[PDB]
Design a protein around this ligand. Structure first.
Ligand SMILES: OC[C@H]1O[C@@H](O[C@H]2[C@H](O)[C@@H](O)[C@H](O[C@H]3[C@H](O)[C@@H](O)[C@H](O[C@H]4[C@H](O)[C@@H](O)[C@H](O)O[C@@H]4CO)O[C@@H]3CO)O[C@@H]2CO)[C@H](O)[C@@H](O)[C@@H]1O
Ligand SMILES: OC[C@H]1O[C@@H](O[C@H]2[C@H](O)[C@@H](O)[C@H](O[C@H]3[C@H](O)[C@@H](O)[C@H](O[C@H]4[C@H](O)[C@@H](O)[C@H](O)O[C@@H]4CO)O[C@@H]3CO)O[C@@H]2CO)[C@H](O)[C@@H](O)[C@@H]1O
Ligand SMILES: O=S([O-])[O-]
Ligand SMILES: O=S([O-])[O-]
Ligand SMILES: [Cl-]
Ligand SMILES: [Cl-]
Ligand SMILES: [Cl-]
Ligand SMILES: [Cl-]
Ligand SMILES: [Cl-]
Lengths: 417, 414
């Protein structure tokens, strides 16, 4: 009889099945069936907001860290200060992860940390070696990054399976939330930001001089032919598929690709591909105002309209606790959200992962604002049109400025309600 | 003794629904059929990488428009034997039989799995409140534009969202449907995606009639009938926007009827309780909708060809044909199964079946996968002309000239 409904995004090679295995010990102890529904990231904002506005939906949903404020501000999440206390309270979490548990300025936590992830560059070891590129120099600075992409463009290296050259850099130009998360380090590296506090409200800083310098440098990589035209119409899954297929020398992603590299295609990885045997990781290069990468992850939230709140909170404590934290990070290739869980050998013994753990020092998060879901939709949409300027041969500083002005007007409307 | 099959997301729980479909075959033969689900956006990359590498599943789902392109690479096992075991050419609609091969090829290289074609879902409640007659809105282009204008002016608000509905939502980016949704407007104007000229196939997207059809469609967004936000979204996002009650009208296949009668499906939503279907309107020169579906193909590097062929006969066979169509909401590929009472009884589905009369598809060419990538990319930039307020006849012509140059290259080679 007793059931729970949980919504997750595709975090692991076999999302529903892996989640079912993760919760099996809880299901057997409590005599509960946890039903899981997988929502792709592209529809997850629409589906979660429609649950919020309708009052009908699951007991628990996965919430991207950048959406916790936005859904909390709709008044639909259960406070979970009790669960967080039971898991060790504020000390049990990195400060950046603890801020993701609530809407900025709220007294009560409305989400439990589930997993963490941050961005770095995967590269083809074989492709950089053949081009004569030193990883240490290419990922040190913006100048080094561009110097390496130039050598990768000139290289006569061809993928062993494709028999064709690799694009130096692939990056998604449409649909994905990653259209923003992939731009943010460039913006931040130049001394810009997505938003700023002015007149005791938040507003867009995407049309600030330093935000435009960072974004213009990133887009100019495609204008200089380091990113293929075709990339600029693709989403995150398509660029990941292009790297697996041996079409791209370099791309930005999270630590999950290390796990996908070790698993056959049948089970949702790319162990059969050349890229899997030729996998390097390097941090984002320092920009003129320092080194930054996107730090995020996902939390778990309980709808305050749930019929099963005590049992749902027992599942939250289980999923946020040390055993399930290590197990899900092993299955997904994410990092645990719980600080303690980072010391497991699965994480400390993993050399590509150690690059991500070290890169966390330069990790940066968006403020946890009401309206952030709106900011991300509008940013993805307007940055997507910035990539179109490149494809159309219309990228100039003034055209980017006029487009980020439009972006900033729409974003400011979403932040003011 | 094992088979690997790659499928696309055809049903609400793709792997689980597939595993239940094959469980009776697994028990008859003592075999495990392992299934891997590939999203449509990555399925062309993954299938072509299998073809070029010599490494992949035993069977793959192949969208009908890709059968020629994968067949041309010489990687598919001939399956005329399976098709004979299922009754041969007479056991299939001619349009479905076309998709079993590269155009002009001697041997069949794919087995028909399911069929789908496009029509318009609409909110019965939204059109009633706007004073729009569905039969008149979906009869002609003038009716279609007149109806969208009434839907734009309407004061109707979704009961759950308490907000107005977009008249029309259509995906502007990423999905293959960016082409399949443009094609009926192109075709209705007397145009086409490609034509045979000078001994070759080439793009006809810059032909005068193709530009009139395409400009009419795009001008629906220029007139405020499609929200700017839609023009940056993909098929799943538009489907989610309709389910959430944000769109009065959208183009889709028969699978949404099945999604509409299943819980979180979207049975609980206002859109499911107020759901109509109407065929594509007649255009000036003709009345057309996209007709497609998916076949199953066997890689000639499979180590299990005899067992794989037994799975193909099972999946293409009457029992599995009906059961998979019931689980997915697609139409059976097998001629027989269109007449099964389960399909006949369903009034929204009867609309799809009878709309098959106007069904058209692309010729089965080598390089069609590349044509679809390039078409989606260039049409995506046509939608951007609208979002940027730069849509003119000349800017569209310039863009489809570029599209045609890139497409003509893709019809020659990768
Ligand atoms: O802004 C929202 C939220 O973003 C979180 O970051 C997400 C990215 O949004 C997401 O794109 C990223 O990558 C996903 C990707 O979208 C999926 O397409 C992909 O699917 C894989 C999957 O791994 C397998 O099941 C399947 O078989 O293969 C496909 C590839 O075709 O999976 C990846 C990884 O999940 O994931 C990011 C992290 O979840 C931020 O973390 C958060 O802070 C933001 O709030
Ligand atoms: O051109 C290639 C090929 O296309 C075939 O048509 C496909 C369309 O490409 C496809 O977009 C269409 O819609 C899919 C949609 O893309 C998926 O995103 C969606 O996924 C569902 C899923 O089934 C559920 O499990 C999940 O919970 O929700 C998502 C929605 O968020 O499913 C629909 C329907 O499968 O489907 C078309 C039919 O397969 C043509 O048929 C073919 O001829 C062409 O060769
Ligand atoms: O690979 S699973 O079917 O055992
Ligand atoms: O179209 S390429 O990305 O497979
Ligand atoms: Cl910021
Ligand atoms: Cl705008
Ligand atoms: Cl055509
Ligand atoms: Cl004009
Ligand atoms: Cl030409």
């Amino acid at each position: 009889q007793k059931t729970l409904e949980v919504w997750i995004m595709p975090n692991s090679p076999q999302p529903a099945e892996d989640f079912k295995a993760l919760v099996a010990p809880f299901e057997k102890a409590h005599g509960v069936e946890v039903k899981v529904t997988v929502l792709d990231w592209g529809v997850a904002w629409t589906k979660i907001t429609t649950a919020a506005t309708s009052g009908v939906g699951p007991d628990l949903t996965q919430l991207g860290t950048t959406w916790v404020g936005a859904i909390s501000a709709m008044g639909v999440l259960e406070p979970v200060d009790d669960v967080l206390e039971a898991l060790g309270g504020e000390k049990a979490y990195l400060p950046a992860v603890w801020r993701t548990t609530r809407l900025e300025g709220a007294r009560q936590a409305t989400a439990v940390p589930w997993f963490s992830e941050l961005r770095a560059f995967y590269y083809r070891t074989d492709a950089l070696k053949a081009a004569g590129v030193n990883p240490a120099e290419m990922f040190a600075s913006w100048q080094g990054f561009e110097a390496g992409l130039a050598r990768l463009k000139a290289s006569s290296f061809r993928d062993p399976e494709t028999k064709a050259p690799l694009a130096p850099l692939c990056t998604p130009g449409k649909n994905s939330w990653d259209v923003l998360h992939n731009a943010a380090p460039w913006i931040w590296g130049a001394g810009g930001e997505i938003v700023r506090q002015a007149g005791g409200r938040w507003q867009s800083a995407l049309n600030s001089p330093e935000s435009l310098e960072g974004l213009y440098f990133f887009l100019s990589l495609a204008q200089k032919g380091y990113v293929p035209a075709e990339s600029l119409e693709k989403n995150t899954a398509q660029i990941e598929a292009d790297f697996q297929a041996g079409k791209c020398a370099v791309f930005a992603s999270g630590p999950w690709m290390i796990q996908r590299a070790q698993v056959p295609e049948a089970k949702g990885g790319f162990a059969e591909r050349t890229a899997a045997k030729n996998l390097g990781v390097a941090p984002y290069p320092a920009g003129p105002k320092g080194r930054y990468t996107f730090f995020g992850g996902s939390n778990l939230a309980l709808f305050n309209f749930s019929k099963n709140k005590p049992l749902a909170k027992e599942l939250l404590k289980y999923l946020g606790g040390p055993e399930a934290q290590v197990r899900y990070a092993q299955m997904t290739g994410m990092l645990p959200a719980l600080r303690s869980a980072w010391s497991d050998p699965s994480f400390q013994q993993n050399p590509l992962l150690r690059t991500f753990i070290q890169a966390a020092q330069f990790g940066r998060t968006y403020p946890s604002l009401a309206g952030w879901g709106g900011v991300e939709n509008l940013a993805v949409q307007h940055l997507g049109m910035a990539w179109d300027l490149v494809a159309q041969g219309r990228l100039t500083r003034e055209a980017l400025k006029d487009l980020m002005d439009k972006a900033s007007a729409a974003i400011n409307q979403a932040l003011r309600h």
